[PDB]
Design a protein around this motif. Sequence first.
Motif, short mmCIF file in Angstrom:
data_model
loop_
_atom_site.label_atom_id
_atom_site.label_comp_id
_atom_site.label_asym_id
_atom_site.label_seq_id
_atom_site.Cartn_x
_atom_site.Cartn_y
_atom_site.Cartn_z
N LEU A 163 0.83 -1.20 0.00
CA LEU A 163 0.00 0.00 0.00
C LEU A 163 0.86 1.25 0.00
O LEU A 163 0.57 2.21 -0.72
CB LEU A 163 -0.92 0.00 1.22
CG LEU A 163 -1.79 1.22 1.49
CD1 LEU A 163 -2.71 1.50 0.33
CD2 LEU A 163 -2.59 0.98 2.75
N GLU A 164 1.91 1.26 0.82
CA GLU A 164 2.85 2.37 0.80
C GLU A 164 3.36 2.59 -0.62
O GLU A 164 3.35 3.72 -1.13
CB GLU A 164 4.00 2.09 1.76
CG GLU A 164 3.77 2.62 3.15
CD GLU A 164 4.66 1.95 4.17
OE1 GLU A 164 5.40 1.03 3.77
OE2 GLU A 164 4.62 2.33 5.37
N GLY A 165 3.76 1.51 -1.28
CA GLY A 165 4.27 1.64 -2.64
C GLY A 165 3.21 2.11 -3.62
O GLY A 165 3.50 2.89 -4.52
N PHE A 166 1.98 1.64 -3.45
CA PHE A 166 0.89 1.99 -4.36
C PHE A 166 0.50 3.45 -4.22
O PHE A 166 0.23 4.12 -5.22
CB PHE A 166 -0.30 1.06 -4.11
CG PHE A 166 -1.57 1.45 -4.83
CD1 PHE A 166 -1.63 1.51 -6.21
CD2 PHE A 166 -2.72 1.74 -4.10
CE1 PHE A 166 -2.81 1.85 -6.86
CE2 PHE A 166 -3.92 2.08 -4.75
CZ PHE A 166 -3.96 2.14 -6.13
N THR A 167 0.45 3.97 -2.98
CA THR A 167 0.14 5.39 -2.79
C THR A 167 1.22 6.26 -3.40
O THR A 167 0.92 7.26 -4.07
CB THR A 167 -0.03 5.72 -1.31
OG1 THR A 167 -1.09 4.92 -0.75
CG2 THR A 167 -0.35 7.22 -1.13
N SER A 172 -7.54 14.75 -0.34
CA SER A 172 -6.36 15.32 -0.98
C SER A 172 -5.27 14.26 -1.05
O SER A 172 -5.28 13.29 -0.29
CB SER A 172 -5.84 16.55 -0.21
OG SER A 172 -5.04 16.14 0.89
N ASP A 173 -4.35 14.46 -1.99
CA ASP A 173 -3.04 13.83 -1.98
C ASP A 173 -3.13 12.30 -2.03
O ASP A 173 -2.28 11.60 -1.47
CB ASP A 173 -2.23 14.29 -0.77
CG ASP A 173 -1.86 15.77 -0.85
OD1 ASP A 173 -1.39 16.32 0.17
OD2 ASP A 173 -2.03 16.38 -1.93
N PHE A 174 -4.15 11.79 -2.73
CA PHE A 174 -4.32 10.36 -2.94
C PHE A 174 -4.32 9.59 -1.62
O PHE A 174 -3.99 8.40 -1.59
CB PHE A 174 -3.24 9.80 -3.88
CG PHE A 174 -3.10 10.56 -5.16
CD1 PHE A 174 -3.86 10.25 -6.26
CD2 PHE A 174 -2.19 11.60 -5.27
CE1 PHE A 174 -3.73 10.95 -7.45
CE2 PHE A 174 -2.06 12.31 -6.45
CZ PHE A 174 -2.83 11.98 -7.54
N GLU A 175 -4.68 10.26 -0.52
CA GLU A 175 -4.63 9.61 0.79
C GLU A 175 -5.70 8.54 0.94
O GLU A 175 -5.52 7.58 1.69
CB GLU A 175 -4.76 10.63 1.91
CG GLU A 175 -3.68 11.68 1.96
CD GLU A 175 -4.03 12.80 2.93
OE1 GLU A 175 -5.03 12.65 3.66
OE2 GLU A 175 -3.31 13.83 2.97
#
Lengths: 348, 120
Positions: free
Chosen positions: A231-235, A279-282
Motif C-alpha cells: 500500500l505504501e508503494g501503491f500510494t 487530498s493527496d491520494f490519501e
Amino acid sequence: VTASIDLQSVSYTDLATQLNDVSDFGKMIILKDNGFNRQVHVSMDKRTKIQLDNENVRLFNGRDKDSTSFILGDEFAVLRFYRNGESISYIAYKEAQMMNEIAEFYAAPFKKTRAINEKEAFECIYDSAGKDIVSVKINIDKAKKILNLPECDYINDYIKTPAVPSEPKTVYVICLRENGSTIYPNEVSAQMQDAANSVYAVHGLKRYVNFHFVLYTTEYSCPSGDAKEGLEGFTASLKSNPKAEGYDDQIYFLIRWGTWDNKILGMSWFNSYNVNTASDFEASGMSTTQLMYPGVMAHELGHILGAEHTDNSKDLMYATFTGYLSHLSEKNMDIIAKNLGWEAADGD
Amino acid sequence: VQLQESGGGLVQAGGSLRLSCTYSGQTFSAWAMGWFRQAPGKERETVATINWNGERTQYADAVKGRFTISRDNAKDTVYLEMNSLKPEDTAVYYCASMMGTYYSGSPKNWGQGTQVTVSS
Ligand SMILES: [Zn+2]
C-alpha cells in the motif's frame, strides 16, 4: 404472463433480454426453479456507475424482501440472491470461449472433491454431442465448507493517516488492476456493488454520494507479499503518475485476485476520506477481488471512511473474514456518514 | 463477548437502585446499549437504550422521568439509575449490546440478568 427466468437453463441472453426490459418504474420477474418460485420486483440501480476498461456495467436491485441483485455488462451477467441465508450467484458470460474458461476456473478447486458433494457448491448449467455451458451456479458458503480452506483475515489492515446537498456528490472509486494480475469482470463488479451498497444502507447516504467506479491497469505491482509495503508503494505510485494529477481527492483501490502475506485480504489508509478535505491520494487502499471472499472492498472502503474494527462476528467490520456485507456498528455508521457530509439533523 | 449485570436485589417501594452492566470485550464503544426487563409470565420489554457515545437516550414510557441510562466508555460499563421504584418495576433486568441504532436496533449479546424485587 409475468416474465420469468428458468434458473435450470439460465444463459447470458436470458439475463440480458430480461434486465434490458427493466424500465424506470421497475418490472416483476419470476425466479423459477424446481417448485421454488420467487417473484422479485427489479429496478435499475441509479446510485452507482461502473466502467471496467471503459466497458459499461449496470446494476439492478430487488426490493429488500427480495434479497436479490443483478449485474449486466455487454460481456457478462450476474444474478445473486439468498436461499436459507446462503449467498448464491448465477454467473453467465456472453461468449462461449470465455464462459468455458470461467466454468473451468471455478471447477478446478474441486478437482479432488466427490461429485455428490460438489453439486451443492458448484454447478454447470447447460444449453437445452458435447454440452454447452451457459452459466455456473456457486454457493460460496457451501463451497467454503466443502474445500475447507484456511481462513483469511484483515488482522492489521489499516494504517493511521498519512443541509442535504441538492444532488448527491459524485465520488470516483478509481480501481487499478495490479500489473500482471488476472481479474475477472463478474468478480470485480460484485465487489464494487457490495462496497457501494454497504455505504448507501447507512443513514440514507445515497442523498450524499453516488459512487462511480472505473477500472484500468497500472504499471505498479507490489514489491513483496507484505500488504503494508504494498500500500505504501501503491500510494507513492499515484503521486508519481501525471495521468492522475487533478484527481487527488478521489478514492483509489489497487486490486488483484489473490491475498497478501499472512492471508491478509486487503489494506487501506484509515479515515483518509472526507468530502471536504480529501487530498493527496490519501484515500487509497488495496483489495482482493475473488468470489469466495465477498465484501472485502466494502470492508476496506469502510476503513477509508473511518469505520473501525468491531467484535461482532456478523459485522462487516469484524477483524476476521465473515462474508457479511452490512455495517452493524452505530459508531461506524455515524462516522462514515459524517465523513460524507451527513448530520443527525438531516435524518435518514 | 461477555456482559455482567449487578446492583439488583431487594428494595422497598419509593427506594432507589443503580444497576451496572460490565462489558468484557474489545469494542464496547462500537455499539448502542440497552436495558430490558422480564417478569415471570410476562413478555420482555425495553427499558432504556443509549447512543454508542452516551449522548442520546430513549426511555420506555413507564420509566421516563424515573430511570436514567448512562454509559461510561472510559470504563466499559453501562448504568441504569432507578429512582421511585414501584412494585410493577419488579423483574429480571438484563443489559445487551445492540446492532444498529439506539432507536431502531436489535439486542444481540445478553447479560446474565439481575433480580430486582420492589416490596410494599
Ligand atoms: Zn480491517
